[PDB]
Amino acid sequence: LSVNVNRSVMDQFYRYKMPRLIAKVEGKGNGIKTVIVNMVDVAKALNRPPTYPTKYFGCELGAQTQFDVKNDRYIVNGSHEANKLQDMLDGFIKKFVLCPECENPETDLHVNPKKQTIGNSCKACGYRGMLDTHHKLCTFILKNPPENSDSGTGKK
């Protein structure tokens, strides 16, 4: 490796982007807190800031959260690396992705606004059924009902 770090840049930047989660460790709070400077950028670029669900994640690291309004910077007690945040958040998705029939092949999930429920289909055995199992991340996502009708296939 005889070039620049390119840690903050490297993609060709032409049309496709990948908002990865970046975590930074600081020496403040009880002696070590995690500060996410990309949580608002990634959340704002795809939706709102997960300041509400920030408490659940803190419960896992034994730490809670911290918010700055005059600063717009939010920190979570405890120091963790970006790769670590994916492991815990990944366990949440594991609750439904690993279905008792398609816990391997990539499956899709379709939520119907008429029945107010999430469907789950796997392209490996036809599974295609319901997505929920129990009070799990399925409800958080179910809060975003899609939009469809009886005709007009095409618009995105």
From Swiss-Prot:
<comment type="similarity">
    <text>Belongs to the eIF-2-beta/eIF-5 family.</text>
</comment>
<protein>
    <recommendedName>
        <fullName>Eukaryotic translation initiation factor 5</fullName>
    </recommendedName>
</protein>
<feature type="site" description="Arginine finger">
    <location>
        <position position="15"/>
    </location>
</feature>
<feature type="binding site">
    <location>
        <begin position="27"/>
        <end position="34"/>
    </location>
    <ligand>
        <name>GTP</name>
    </ligand>
</feature>
<feature type="modified residue" description="Phosphoserine">
    <location>
        <position position="10"/>
    </location>
</feature>
<comment type="function">
    <text>Component of the 43S pre-initiation complex (43S PIC), which binds to the mRNA cap-proximal region, scans mRNA 5'-untranslated region, and locates the initiation codon. In this complex, acts as a GTPase-activating protein, by promoting GTP hydrolysis by eIF2G (EIF2S3). During scanning, interacts with both EIF1 (via its C-terminal domain (CTD)) and EIF1A (via its NTD). This interaction with EIF1A contributes to the maintenance of EIF1 within the open 43S PIC. When start codon is recognized, EIF5, via its NTD, induces eIF2G (EIF2S3) to hydrolyze the GTP.</text>
</comment>
<comment type="subunit">
    <text>Component of the 43S pre-initiation complex (43S PIC), which is composed of the 40S ribosomal subunit, EIF1, eIF1A (EIF1AX), eIF3 complex, EIF5 and eIF2-GTP-initiator tRNA complex (eIF2 ternary complex). Interacts with eIF1A (EIF1AX) during scanning. Interacts through its C-terminal domain (CTD) with EIF1 or with eIF2-beta (EIF2S2) (mutually exclusive) through a common binding site. Interacts through its C-terminal domain (CTD) with the CTD of EIF5B. Interacts with FMR1 isoform 6; this interaction occurs in a RNA-dependent manner.</text>
</comment>
